[PDB]
């Protein structure tokens, strides 16, 4: 059965990007998916997006610009502390110059570079580059 909705959303975008398609449809929608998409959009990796109401959790249509190399999920939501975050970005990123880990923290869902300014740890959700 469907054990996790965020893993479907990112796998669906990742297969559409590799085929060269200009749009994709995500279903079911969730509060976690809308907040994750917003972090990719603010850094310039995807275009703007629209939500459809249907009285059953809803759907999203997203616009693609061709810049995204990958996006992905870490399935157990492991806890991270500021001293251990260096080991995770050494494992998951392609260079020290670009790409982002996404964390959930009591100050909100955010970019791993913002978590250092806000002096906060959290749980891992995923990444993009």
């Amino acid at each position: 059965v469907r054990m996790n909705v965020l893993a479907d959303a990112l796998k669906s975008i990742n297969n559409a990007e590799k085929r060269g398609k200009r749009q994709v449809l995500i279903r079911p929608c969730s509060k976690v998916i809308v907040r994750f998409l917003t972090v990719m959009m603010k850094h310039g990796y995807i275009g703007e997006f629209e939500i459809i109401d249907d009285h059953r959790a809803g759907k999203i249509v997203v616009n693609l610009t061709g810049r995204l190399n990958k996006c992905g999920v870490i399935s157990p939501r492991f806890d991270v502390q500021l001293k251990d975050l260096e080991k995770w970005q050494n494992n998951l990123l392609p260079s020290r110059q670009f790409g982002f880990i996404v964390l959930t923290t009591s100050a909100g869902i955010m970019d791993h570079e913002e978590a250092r300014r806000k002096h906060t740890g959290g749980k891992i959700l995923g990444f993009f580059f």
Partner: protein
């Protein structure tokens, strides 16, 4: 292919690894202790024994020779061994009913080269080394 990943799975992961280590051939013989009871040295690097008999063993094909060996009884267990004698003419130093120090042949209990079934070599005769006898530095005291 299907490995479990859930955040409370540590008992399944830890105990499945523990169970599967017993299929590694090197791990098993080090931890059961049957190999330590079987080994004719009780975990030592060397042993002393007394020379029973001098013998020549036929080498395995595709080559042809008679390899000079000795049959030996160990002091601490009374069990029986056969051992190789290195270098040209060294069998003339050995005599019979006297002490040798013996060592492994270099492959951790397996046989070496064309010699069938020989696992050990001689290194010292009557408290003098075969190298010191062969290079003329010392002689057997009589």
């Amino acid at each position: 292919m299907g490995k479990c990943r859930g955040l409370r799975t540590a008992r399944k992961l830890r105990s499945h690894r523990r169970d599967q280590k017993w299929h590694d051939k090197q791990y098993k013989k080090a931890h059961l202790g049957t190999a330590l009871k079987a080994n004719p040295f009780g975990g030592a690097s060397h042993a002393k024994g007394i020379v029973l008999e001098k013998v020549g063993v036929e080498a395995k094909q595709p080559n042809s020779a008679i390899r000079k060996c000795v049959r030996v009884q160990l002091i601490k267990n009374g069990k029986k061994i056969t051992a190789f004698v290195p270098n040209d003419g060294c069998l003339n130093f050995i005599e019979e009913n006297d002490e040798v120090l013996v060592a492994g042949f270099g492959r951790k209990g397996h046989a070496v080269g064309d010699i069938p079934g020989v696992r050990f070599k001689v290194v010292k005769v009557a408290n003098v080394s075969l190298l010191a006898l062969y290079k003329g530095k010392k002689e057997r005291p009589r």
